């Protein structure tokens, strides 16, 4: 349970699980997973 990279999955996999399943949406989570953000 040291995997960071792994956490960075279950985090998004986590979302996905209750996410609209849109591949567009997937992009969303997939960036959130990397912990990205909307700057300003």
């Amino acid at each position: 349970f040291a995997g960071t990279v792994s956490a960075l999955a279950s985090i998004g996999l986590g979302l996905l699980g209750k996410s609209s399943a849109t591949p567009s949406v997937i992009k969303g989570i997939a960036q959130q997973a990397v912990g990205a953000v909307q700057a300003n």
Binding site: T4, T22, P23, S24, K27, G28, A36, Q38
Partner: protein
């Protein structure tokens, strides 16, 4: 709408004061919608992939449009080459009248190839192509030796009323294939490729029409053996005619030799008129009269008709005994005493004369790519293709062609797999007429994209074609890559769009008018 920014450190990553990565995924300016948020690159790409030339001057181009939005590559370099070539009739057909109502035919083959743009061949006379006519053509493109020394876009006679030239893509072509300085990238994809064939004609005699149609072609790596002590080769003497001088007097044969090393051919005994390559293998461009004789020191041992002909330190002398206004007889002569002379019958503007040679030179193995020359027939295309379009050049101020991910439903990464010596086969065409060694075009062929051709017909000697091409390639750089310094993260997968595109494309004809550019 809004901008996105990913962190160097992944949630939790604990880097040192100089660790991490050295990059910073350029921000995401993906635009927004009720259902999707493609990034300007994703978007730009869509339009570019769709209407390359237009979408740009259309203003709809933007962001990493030269990158494909299918979030496949973790990192990738990419760009677009917009080389603009002006194709125009080869023969300065001298006319006495004030109105040389002459017309010429011309056709272009587009290959979604890494370094190659498209091919083109015209007929000074508007005559169509004959089988054997066509064949010579073909066998010529297979026999082209130091092909690189042709990218200049220069015209080249192969048939009587026929010439042909090949156009590279300025930079990718500007990336050599030698072990010393330049080697390609690990692989790539033709992100989108379009060409406009502007009908540059005097708005006086704007006659003519053209047919365009996309045809997919996948290459076949019919590879060449790696030789050691000796290597098999082919001595080529494609006899031709002096674009100006008297056939029945002077000939213009091109003389190359498949695996034998490039060695300067200086005309010694004769009248004069030579132009040798710079390619790695030995080839020559020379025109002259009978008595004339060129020379050169044979880089390596050479056999032929069984018996040895030359040795490293030998000096070969090539001449021509007879020059009918259409046929040509020639002689090849070795220093090496005990050897006998070589002679052979050719026919300028016709097939080449082959000479199963053998060169005392280690031979790197390299594949040759067996590629079916797309319907070149005035009217074959018209048949095997329903999605072809066609109008008069007058109307459609030219032709607009947009290639597309034709072969694979999705965008694979055509890599080194299919790379090599283009060697075109076709129906009715005999390969026996195919030159040996690694000659012909050499390039990585985007096996995903749609190859495609467009023949112009019934135009005027005066009318010329400005081919504005927009080639968009993306690939992964390895080493020595003079480009690796441009690669960033690969486009994000926005299939939402992508699919649409694919549909359109499919749904559409990759051909349009240079007025819909």
């Amino acid at each position: 709408q809004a901008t996105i920014l990913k962190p160097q450190l992944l949630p939790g990553e604990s880097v040192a004061p100089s660790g991490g990565r050295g990059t910073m995924d350029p921000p995401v300016h993906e635009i927004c919608a009720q259902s999707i948020d493609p990034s300007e690159g994703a978007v730009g790409w869509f339009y570019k992939y769709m209407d390359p030339a237009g979408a740009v001057e259309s203003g709809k181009a933007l962001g990493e449009f030269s990158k494909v939005p299918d979030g496949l590559l973790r990192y990738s370099v990419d760009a677009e080459q917009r080389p603009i070539v002006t194709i125009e009739c080869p023969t300065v057909s001298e006319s006495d009248l004030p109105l040389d109502g002459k017309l010429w035919r011309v056709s272009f083959i587009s290959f979604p190839a890494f370094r190659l743009n498209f091919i083109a061949l015209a007929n000074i006379n508007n005559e169509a192509l004959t089988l054997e006519t066509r064949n010579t053509f073909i066998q010529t493109l297979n026999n082209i030796t130091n092909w690189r020394d042709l990218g200049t876009g220069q015209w080249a006679q192969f048939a009587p009323g026929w010439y042909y030239s090949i156009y590279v893509l300025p930079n990718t072509y500007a990336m050599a294939e030698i072990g010393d300085r330049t080697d390609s990238v690990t692989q790539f994809r033709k992100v989108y490729k379009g060409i406009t064939f502007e009908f540059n004609a005097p708005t006086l005699i704007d006659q003519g029409w053209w047919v365009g149609a996309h045809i997919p072609v996948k290459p076949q790596s019919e590879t060449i053996p790696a030789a050691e002590r000796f290597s098999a080769g082919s001595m080529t003497v494609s006899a031709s005619n002096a674009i100006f001088q008297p056939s029945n007097t002077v000939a213009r044969i091109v003389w190359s030799i498949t695996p034998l090393p490039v060695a300067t051919v200086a005309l010694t005994t004769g009248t004069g008129g030579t132009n040798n390559t710079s390619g790695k293998f030995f080839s020559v461009e020379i025109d002259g009269n009978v008595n004339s004789v060129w020379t050169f020191t044979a880089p390596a041992s050479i056999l032929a008709e069984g018996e040895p002909f030359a040795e490293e330190g030998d000096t070969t002398s090539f001449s021509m005994t007879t020059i009918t206004a259409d046929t040509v007889v020639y002689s090849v002569s070795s220093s090496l005493t005990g050897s006998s002379v070589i002679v052979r019958g050719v026919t300028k503007g016709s097939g080449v004369s082959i000479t199963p040679v053998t060169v005392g030179i280690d031979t790197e193995a390299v594949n040759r790519l067996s590629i079916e020359m797309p319907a070149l027939t005035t009217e074959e295309v018209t048949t095997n293709v329903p999605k072809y379009e066609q109008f008069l050049c007058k109307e459609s101020g030219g032709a607009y062609i947009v290639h597309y991910k034709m072969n694979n439903p999705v965008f694979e990464m055509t890599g080194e797999e299919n790379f090599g010596g283009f060697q075109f086969h076709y129906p009715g065409y005999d390969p026996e007429n195919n030159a040996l060694g690694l000659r012909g075009i050499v390039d990585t062929f985007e096996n995903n994209f749609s190859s495609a051709v467009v023949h112009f017909w019934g135009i005027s000697q005066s009318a010329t074609i400005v081919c504005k091409t927009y080639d968009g390639w993306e690939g992964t750089t390895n080493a020595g890559s003079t480009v690796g310094q441009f690669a960033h993260t690969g486009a994000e997968e926005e299939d939402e769009v992508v699919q649409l595109a694919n549909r359109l494309q499919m749904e559409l004809t990759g051909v349009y008018q240079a007025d819909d550019n």
